[PDB]
Amino acid sequence: IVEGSDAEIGMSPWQVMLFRKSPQELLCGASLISDRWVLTAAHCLLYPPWDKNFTENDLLVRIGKHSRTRYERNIEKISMLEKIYIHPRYNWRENLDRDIALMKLKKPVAFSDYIHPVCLPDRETAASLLQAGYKGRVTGWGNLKETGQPSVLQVVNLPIVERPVCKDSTRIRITDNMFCAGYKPDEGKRGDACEGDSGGPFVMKSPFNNRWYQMGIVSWGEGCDRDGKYGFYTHVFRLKKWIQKVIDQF
Amino acid sequence: DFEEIPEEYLQ
Amino acid sequence: TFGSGEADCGLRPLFEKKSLEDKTERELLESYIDGR
Numbered sequence: 122i123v124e125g126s127d128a129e130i131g132m133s134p135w136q137v138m139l140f141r142k143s144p145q146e147l148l149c150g151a152s153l154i155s156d157r158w159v160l161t162a163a164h165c166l167l168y169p170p171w172d173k174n175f176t177e178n179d180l181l182v183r184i185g186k187h188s189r190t191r192y193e194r195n196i197e198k199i200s201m202l203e204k205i206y207i208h209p210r211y212n213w214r215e216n217l218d219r220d221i222a223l224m225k226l227k228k229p230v231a232f233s234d235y236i237h238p239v240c241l242p243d244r245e246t247a248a249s250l251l252q253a254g255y256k257g258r259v260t261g262w263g264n265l266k267e268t269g270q271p272s273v274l275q276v277v278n279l280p281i282v283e284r285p286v287c288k289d290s291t292r293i294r295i296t297d298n299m300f301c302a303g304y305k306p307d308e309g310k311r312g313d314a315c316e317g318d319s320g321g322p323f324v325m326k327s328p329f330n331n332r333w334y335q336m337g338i339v340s341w342g343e344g345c346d347r348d349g350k351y352g353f354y355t356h357v358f359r360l361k362k363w364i365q366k367v368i369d370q371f
Numbered sequence: 372d373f374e375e376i377p378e379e380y381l382q
Numbered sequence: 383t384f385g386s387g388e389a390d391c392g393l394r395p396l397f398e399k400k401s402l403e404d405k406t407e408r409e410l411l412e413s414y415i416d417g418r
């Protein structure tokens with residue numbers, strides 16, 4: 122996260138860390154949506170251009186963290202995966218369209234003051250909050266600059282940008298399964314997710330029922346916090362039927 | 372940079 | 383898990399459940415043309 126600050130303890134109790142077993146490293150961010158399911162970005166698990174194709178056996182999920190490198194004994198839980206589901210039409214060849222994956226944990230995790238799931242939006246909450254100008258929050262342990270790394274979880278609140286502005290900032294083809302967020306060069310405010318934050322959550326707090334909803338998944342951006350550029354996120358509500366389907370099917 | 376995590380989580 | 387989440391979803395033990403606010407959520411609600 123660039124130009125974001127340290128998170129508070131228990132601020133994003135749904136933040137998950139995808140950890141690789143050997144080498145032991147942070148792979149991506151993810152979020153806890155139930156006691157057995159985690160949602161992340163599919164490019165964190167499968168990205169052929171760079172020979173990335175992880176299986177159940179190569180990842181570990183760490184929930185309840187704050188600190189990036191320490192094993193927070195008695196606070197965090199580490200779960201193993203049972204199955205990984207990548208959206209059938211995830212497009213890695215061209216623009217990372219439908220960059221979403223679900224991971225089923227081996228065993229349910231117990232919630233605590235540090236582990237609690239986020240809500241997935243329903244048509245009406247999506248419709249009322251995903252508006253240009255409304256701010257959302259992104260969290261992660263990713264890089265602090267494009268070109269070090271934080272010791273603690275970082276948070277940044279970014280405004281959602283109008284789609285034409287998003288499209289006119291890149292040469293990549295934007296689809297309706299993506300949205301972009303960030304400040305204009307012109308708003309003398311900065312912030313963006315960056316490398317290491319892919320897969321994590323973009324959430325908004327409903328002013329109707331005070332709950333936090335995960336509207337997006339950190340997907341991509343060109344550089345980190347470059348002026349004139351924005352971060353793109355997968356549109357969770359547009360892929361919600363796929364989500365509902367693998368959950369009640371599996 | 373990452374501290375060691377308990378062996379029971381590798382197996 | 384599904385629509386609107388899970389049931390007790392989105393309410394943080396250390397914040398909403400105790401009626402405590404984190405330091406920047408205000409920024410968010412204020413951008414939804416102000417909330418409350």
Ligand SMILES: N=C(N)c1ccc2[nH]c(-c3cccc(-c4ccccc4)c3O)nc2c1
Pocket residue numbers: 148149164165166168173313314315316317318319339340341342343344345346351352353
């Ligand atoms: N500026 C942004 N909004 C942004 C957000 C997420 C990113 N993630 C990355 C990223 C960069 C290199 C490799 C990966 C990656 C991670 C896992 C598997 C394959 C590639 C990234 O997620 N850059 C990113 C940039």
Ligand code: NA
Pocket residue numbers: 303304313346347348349350351
């Ligand atoms: Na920018």
